[PDB]
Amino acid sequence: GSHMTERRLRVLVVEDESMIAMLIEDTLCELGHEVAATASRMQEALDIARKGQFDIAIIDVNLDGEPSYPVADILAERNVPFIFATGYGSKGLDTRYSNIPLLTKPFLDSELEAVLVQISKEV
Numbered sequence: 001g002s003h004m005t006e007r008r009l010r011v012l013v014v015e016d017e018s019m020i021a022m023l024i025e026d027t028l029c030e031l032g033h034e035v036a037a038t039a040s041r042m043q044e045a046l047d048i049a050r051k052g053q054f055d056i057a058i059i060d061v062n063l064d065g066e067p068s069y070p071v072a073d074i075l076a077e078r079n080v081p082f083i084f085a086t087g088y089g090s091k092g093l094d095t096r097y098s099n100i101p102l103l104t105k106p107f108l109d110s111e112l113e114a115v116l117v118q119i120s121k122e123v
């Protein structure tokens with residue numbers, strides 16, 4: 001309807017080290033998001049999952065330890081509006097995006113895709 005949202009856009013992207021940290025400050029720089037998430041954190045990672053409408057969340061890296069806890073995995077068995085990427089590459093996350101913006105944060109076409117494969121969709 002009319003009463004919608006335009007400032008609730010947030011993206012929580014996390015993983016072991018901070019390689020994802022500044023990797024986010026650049027995303028919000030373009031989107032203008034309010035606050036993103038850096039490094040893997042069970043406390044903040046829970047906010048990207050329990051929120052339900054946090055826009056997007058990335059608890060990548062699930063290898064050499066499978067550090068994804070039941071907060072991201074669960075977030076996958078149902079998949080809401082968001083995106084993800086880990087050593088796996090998304091088994092089949094079903095989001096309202098298109099099942100195309102997913103990966104393992106290999107740094108080369110990851111996060112960018114999630115923001116490039118969308119382009120809003122208003123051509």
Ligand code: BEF
Pocket residue numbers: 014015016019020059060061062086087104105
């Ligand atoms: F960087 Be998260 F290692 F996958």
Ligand SMILES: [Ca+2]
Pocket residue numbers: 015016017019020061
């Ligand atoms: Ca990492």
